[PDB]
């Protein structure tokens, strides 16, 4: 059982941090909350780090 948000459209369970469904592009449900303990796979981890770096100025 993958941990993440079920897309109510296609039923795929998505990475907690993805803005839309990896299969069908539908938006992430409003009230779903990230796990207390989320450890993203290496690719998603790098994606998230990149987005943070882009917001930062140093």
């Amino acid at each position: 059982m993958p941990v993440g948000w079920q897309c109510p459209g296609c039923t795929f369970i998505n990475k907690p941090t993805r803005p839309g469904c990896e299969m069908c592009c539908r938006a992430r449900p409003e009230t779903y909350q990230i796990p207390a303990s989320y450890q993203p796979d290496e690719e998603e981890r790098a994606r998230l780090a990149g987005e943070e770096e882009a917001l930062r100025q140093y």
Partner: protein, 151 residues
């Protein structure tokens, strides 16, 4: 045994299968019924995307189970478009798509004419005639959309 495949358009496809059939086999049966090439098909069961080389039994798919079918462009990818007004949208595109094409896709989802869209990537405003490949925009890249509002 019979299994059912739900599509996003609302139709259901009924297939005759064996527990030993591969996902590849199942996609070929869907192509037989619907004409959709296997390479455009994504099948979902138990919240997972099914792998072509595994069997129905590998996924504990039993008689009367329902799978979900989503169609995707072969060679396509997803990108995210972050607005400044609240939403991040998710788009399917191809590397060969021009910026003009991408704006057309944003218009479909968001209803903004291309002329009022300013797309930005890695600090650069994108030009309509160039492709995603020209800007080295890759899978799961985030673009930024600024709206040009009149007044």
């Amino acid at each position: 045994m019979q299994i059912f495949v739900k599509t996003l358009t609302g139709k259901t496809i009924t297939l005759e299968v064996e527990p030993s059939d591969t996902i590849e086999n199942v996609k070929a049966k869907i192509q037989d019924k619907e004409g959709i090439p296997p390479d455009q098909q994504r099948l979902i069961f138990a919240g997972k995307q099914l792998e072509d080389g595994r069997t129905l039994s590998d996924y504990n798919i039993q008689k009367e189970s329902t799978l979900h079918l989503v169609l995707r462009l072969r060679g396509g990818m997803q990108i995210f478009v972050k607005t400044l007004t609240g939403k991040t949208i998710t788009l399917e595109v191809e590397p060969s798509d021009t910026i003009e094409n991408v704006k057309a896709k944003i218009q479909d989802k968001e209803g903004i004419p291309p002329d009022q869209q300013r797309l930005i990537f890695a600090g650069k405003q994108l030009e309509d005639g160039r492709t995603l490949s020209d800007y080295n925009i890759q899978k799961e890249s985030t673009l930024h959309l600024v709206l040009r509002l009149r007044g």
